[PDB]
Amino acid sequence: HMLSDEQMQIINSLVEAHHKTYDDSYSDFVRFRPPVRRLSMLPHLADLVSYSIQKVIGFAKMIPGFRDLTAEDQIALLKSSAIEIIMLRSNQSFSLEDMSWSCGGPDFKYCINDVTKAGHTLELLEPLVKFQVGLKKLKLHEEEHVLLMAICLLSPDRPGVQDHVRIEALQDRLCDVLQAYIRIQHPGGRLLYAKMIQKLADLRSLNEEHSKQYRSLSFQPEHSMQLTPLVLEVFGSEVS
Amino acid sequence: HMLSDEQMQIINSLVEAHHKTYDDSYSDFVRFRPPVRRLSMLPHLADLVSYSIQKVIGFAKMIPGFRDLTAEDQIALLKSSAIEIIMLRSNQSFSLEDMSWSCGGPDFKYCINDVTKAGHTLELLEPLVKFQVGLKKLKLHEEEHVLLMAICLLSPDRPGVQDHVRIEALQDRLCDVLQAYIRIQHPGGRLLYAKMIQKLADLRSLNEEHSKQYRSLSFQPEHSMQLTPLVLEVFGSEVS
Amino acid sequence: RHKILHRLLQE
Amino acid sequence: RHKILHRLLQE
Ligand SMILES: C=C1CC[C@H](O)C/C1=C/C=C1\CCC[C@@]2(C)[C@H]1CC[C@@H]2[C@@](C)(O)CC(=O)NC(C)C
Ligand SMILES: C=C1CC[C@H](O)C/C1=C/C=C1\CCC[C@@]2(C)[C@H]1CC[C@@H]2[C@@](C)(O)CC(=O)NC(C)C
């Protein structure tokens, strides 16, 4: 088989979207509150997540059909999926040699111990690192990495979503281009689609654990005051 | 005349309170989002104001009788007076030679042009610098500088204040210790009390202009997102 | 509600 | 309301 012109255009739009929103130089990281190694890493990691939310929003706006959804559906999709998209895009800086997210220099190299200094426990950090290792070992083509982030974002099974039918038709079409892409373009990829779909289920589990950890810090005003207004909006519980 | 033991104890408590909350080394400034010289200075100056609000709160908690007020009256007093106390305590770093706030190194030296890079116009910055120059020329003893900040904070004529009678009795007693202090301890200070009281009226005018400027940036979400949660609470319009 | 989110989602 | 302010004003 061969993939069509429509499926090819979807791929081009999604990889362009990612290149426009993921900065491989990590040059804006110098603008965050500096890393410090009680909760010494929270200011820096809150600025990092806030910055990453902005990029996820930018990325989502460029996904074919996302802008056509109501502002309420776009908001419901981003509030539920943002942390899962952050965990996926972070895989690009994750290093198997160091078991850490390496964003250029040693100042922006984050290990398990650095993340516990932002208030997280091993209940989240152990499955998070296991997920990063597992994802990295899949050796995803950039086309597959960007489709997985778009599939994750366009999931209709999220709280507060109204146009379920439309969102499912968008996700289904993306899943079709991914399966076709793996089959035609990825040599030895016969079990890959099933593996990527399983990573989406691992992400639901990570999102749950993350929501518990976020509730723990957001309920302590001395810690929630270190977050940014965008993190408070997106990880918050308000309903539109 | 001579000042009493009660008035002496008030003075000691207020100067101790200031030394505990004003860091002459400016060593925490390295932890803010770095200064950058659209609205390039906003991240740094929002972190500076957020930090300064925390210090004003700490200072207020140590003013004799402030802790005895209801949480609602403490909140009403801080929301109205915070920016005026920030403008007063900032006088300690203000330099007449540079017409700028000098907080150690050149990175933490703020001139009129740096502040316009946080979204402020000359409508506020011209009277603000004129006030800083005027205050600095008064050559206030540290005892007088700390009494003026406490008098400013304990002003009963603020929106949302309930126990007006109690707050006025606290401010009156502070005004009495200031007049007595100037008369007995400040040589050639016969016109000083009247000058310091006028600075309080200049501060009401600056607070007005500041509220307009803050409304202008807080109404633009791309700019309000650069503020911290504590700045949004304290400069916000919510009523308790 | 979602003041920042609405603005970042515009155009 | 004033979640951070209440906490910073405690004790
Ligand atoms: C966000 C990106 C994308 C760009 C680069 O690849 C670097 C990167 C790393 C992400 C990491 C390493 C640090 C800790 C984080 C960012 C984790 C992903 C999730 C985790 C959390 C759990 O700490 C997020 C969080 O919720 N933080 C709190 C402190 C608000
Ligand atoms: C806050 C302190 C105390 C400790 C030191 O002495 C330094 C200092 C300086 C204060 C300044 C110099 C920068 C601009 C400010 C801090 C101004 C006081 C008011 C002004 C404003 C108008 O910009 C505040 C403001 O509202 N900022 C916006 C960006 C949120």
Author numbering:
A (entry chain A), B (entry chain A): 154 to 190, 251 to 453
C (entry chain B), D (entry chain B): 686 to 696
Question: Which sentences from the paper describe this structure?
Answer:
Two analogs (4 and 33) were chosen to co-crystalize with the VDR to decipher their differential modes of interaction in comparison with 20S(OH)D3 and 1,25(OH)2D3. The modifications included replacing C24 with an oxygen, inserting a double bond between C24 and C25 (4), adding an amide group replacing carbons 23 and 24 (33) and adding two fluorine groups at C24 (23). Similarly, the D3-like structure 33 having a 23-amide modification was obtained from the the photochemical opening of the B-ring. Analogs 4 and 33 cause conformational changes in the position of His305 and His397 with quite a substantial change in the case of 33 which formed a hydrogen bond between His397 and the amide group which is in contrast to 20S(OH)D3 which does not interact with this residue. While the exact relationship between these conformational changes induced by 33 and VDR function remain to be elucidated, the change indicates the possibility of producing analogs that display a unique subset of the actions seen for 1,25(OH)2D3 (i.e. are biased agonists), as already seen to some degree for the parental 20S(OH)D3. In contrast, the introduction of an amide linkage into the side chain, as in 33, prevented its hydroxylation by CYP27B1. All analogs tested except 33 were metabolized by CYP27B1. 20S(OH)D3 and 33 displayed similar catalytic efficiencies which were the lowest of the analogs tested and 13-fold lower than for 13.
